[PDB]
């Protein structure tokens, strides 16, 4: 509760501050609020941290909020490349949307009511389409808003009807109450559609093979600030939802999981294989995000202790790195004014440090040990292998492709021979290099003691 | 534009005995079969009939493809060599120099002063060489990739900066 009021308190901060201090004042208070948020991984044992009637926290939420509260400074300096020429009021309103976005994500994770979660869950949309469409760069950013929002509501709205139905039947949907007052789900045909309605809403904000057309249609054209926040935390909103909603969807989950986890299983190889054949750099991370995001779909579906820990570990780790590759996308895109992969090549001979950030980014996304990507992915494999022995040949074959496209972007952009006619790349400012540093260091130095990241089942 | 009847046999000979060197290895062995390759090449010098001459090309190439070394020998610096584009890691284009910080260009002041003079030559000779180009282009652009030389004195040959300021083959 002590996080929300200062987060709202940044709303007058940016809107009033002097013409040139708006970003300085916003950057610091976003950095200071990481203090009080950092006291949220501070956690008791199996019992969740319930500090208010309407707000509560646990070891599953705790990594999430500290990610978002940390995240906002990243989009703050990220936007300080192309918002300089805009007017003051537009610049102030950009912070308004980002700060309004924080106020939502910081509150969905703390919500102790299913509807209150859902109200804020889909409330985060309104700040987004403002970011994607108003401050977007390309032409089809207009089609981006329609694809993003309509996909979300088409699944979210049946969830709302499902939630009120549960409200009338059992009486309440408080996350603790449903856990303690659990009831097995009968195999009645009606329960099948209720199960499908409960899950489908989080599936669409969990790019599934087929329900993912808005992934390349939103991330690519979104502004840099909107790109990472939509890929680092927004995709995780469903991840928090499914980890919570599955408490009332058993035993119907196990029999009904086959149509869904398998579609994620086969598509996660397909979507990774998509990255092997791409022409747009920002489309790589978008499709790579789909494959990585679809990996935890299997983990939550098995409802295995190891799978849930691996899901949470990959959830935060993927968000941190996917945001990073979007920053590296921005710097190259800004210098060359194009998103084509094959245009800017041999950049390492010009920007050696930027190549190192590219090296660390693609290598962490490669998920080597001991990085949080690997331990999250490895726990999923072990849980999946216990569920079925054939699972290794599929999800292992993803790691086949996962290493390929991760190095493919590194080789074709940084390595090789520079293209001669590009006379635009200057030396990198201290901004992006610090932005990359603020992305890479928390991931690496979390590796020593990642038990804040595994989750409540740890 | 054209690999006419003259060069085709000239290139064919070049790849022929280079493969033979890859075969014979030893110099004495190579020399014997090289002169036989040469002697058998010009034994039919007087072949005025072009149809037979083109026919004589056919028995030159198809067994060359059969007779080429399965591990063809290539020197390091040429296509397929062990050192082709090996030093591109060090070849940085000349335009990166002006981005150097005042401390970095005060590090080597004489070169930058000379580099500025080099930049001058490009600046007030560009408009002369493009104008010189335009008045000598044939209609519908150029019919050949070859560049015209410097017509009169003073003006540099057209389109000269990058081919002159090209990074050295051994930059380090």
């Amino acid at each position: 509760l002590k996080i929300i009021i200062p987060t709202t308190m940044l709303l007058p901060m940016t809107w009033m501050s002097k013409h040139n201090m708006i970003w300085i004042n916003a950057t610091v208070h976003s950095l200071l609020i990481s203090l009080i948020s950092l006291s949220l991984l501070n956690q008791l044992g199996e019992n969740s941290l319930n500090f208010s009637l309407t707000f509560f926290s646990d070891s599953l939420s705790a990594p999430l909020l500290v990610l978002t509260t940390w995240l906002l400074p990243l989009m703050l300096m990220a936007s300080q490349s192309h918002l300089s020429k805009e007017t003051t009021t537009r610049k102030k309103l950009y912070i308004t949307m980002l700060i309004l976005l924080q106020l939502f994500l910081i509150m969905t994770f703390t919500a102790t009511e299913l509807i209150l979660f859902y109200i804020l869950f889909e409330a985060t949309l309104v700040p987004t389409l403002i970011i994607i469409t108003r401050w977007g760069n390309q032409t089809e950013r207009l089609n981006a808003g329609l694809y993003f929002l309509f996909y979300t509501l088409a699944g979210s709205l049946p969830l709302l009807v499902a939630l009120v139905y549960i409200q009338n039947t059992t009486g309440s949907l408080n996350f603790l109450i449903i856990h303690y007052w659990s009831h097995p789900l009968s195999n009645s045909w009606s329960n099948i559609f209720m199960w499908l309605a409960c899950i489908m809403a989080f599936m669409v904000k969990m790019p599934l093979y087929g329900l993912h057309l808005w992934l390349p249609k939103a991330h690519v054209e979104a502004p840099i600030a909107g790109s990472m926040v939509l890929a680092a935390v927004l995709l995780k909103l469903g991840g928090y939802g499914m980890m919570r909603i599955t408490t009332i969807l058993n035993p119907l989950t196990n029999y009904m999981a086959y149509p869904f986890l398998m579609l994620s299983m086969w598509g996660m190889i397909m979507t990774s294989s998509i990255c092997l054949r791409q022409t747009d750099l920002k489309s790589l991370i978008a499709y790579s995000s789909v494959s990585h995001m679809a990996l935890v779909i299997v983990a939550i579906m098995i409802q295995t202790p190891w799978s849930f820990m691996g899901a949470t570990a990959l959830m935060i780790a993927h968000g941190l790195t996917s945001s990073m590759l979007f920053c590296l996308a921005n710097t190259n895109y800004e210098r060359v004014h194009s998103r084509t992969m094959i245009l800017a090549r041999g950049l390492q001979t010009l920007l050696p440090l930027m190549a190192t950030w590219w090296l660390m980014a693609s290598l962490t996304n490669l998920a080597l040990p001991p990085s949080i990507n690997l331990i999250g992915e490895l726990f999923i494999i072990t849980a999946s292998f216990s569920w079925s022995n054939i699972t290794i040949i599929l999800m292992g074959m993803n790691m086949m492709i996962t290493a390929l496209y991760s190095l493919y972007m590194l080789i074709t952009t940084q390595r090789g021979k520079y293209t001669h006619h590009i006379n635009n790349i200057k030396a990198s400012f201290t901004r992006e290099n610090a932005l990359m540093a603020l992305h890479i260091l928390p991931l690496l130095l979390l590796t020593l003691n990642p038990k804040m990241i595994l989750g409540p089942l740890y | 534009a054209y690999l006419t009847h003259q060069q085709k046999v000239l290139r064919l000979y070049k790849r022929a005995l280079r493969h033979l060197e890859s075969w014979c290895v030893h110099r004495d062995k190579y020399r014997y079969f090289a002169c036989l390759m040469r002697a058998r090449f010009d034994e039919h010098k007087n072949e005025k009939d072009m149809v037979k001459a083109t026919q004589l090309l056919r028995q030159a190439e198809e067994e060359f493809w059969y007779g080429q070394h399965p591990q063809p020998y290539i020197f390091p610096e040429s296509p397929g060599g062990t050192s082709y584009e090996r030093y591109e890691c060090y070849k940085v284009p000349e335009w990166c120099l002006d981005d150097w910080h005042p401390s970095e260009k005060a590090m080597y002041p004489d070169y930058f002063a000379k580099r500025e003079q080099w930049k001058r030559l490009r600046r007030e000779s560009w408009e002369r060489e493009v104008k010189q180009l335009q008045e000598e282009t044939p209609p519908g652009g150029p019919r050949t990739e070859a560049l015209p030389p410097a017509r009169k004195e003073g003006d540099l040959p057209p389109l000269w900066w990058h081919i002159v300021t090209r990074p050295r083959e051994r930059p380090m």
Partner: peptide, 12 residues
Amino acid sequence: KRLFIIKPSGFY
């Protein structure tokens, strides 16, 4: 005899 070597600006 040594020659000047071009390098990317590493000061920043």
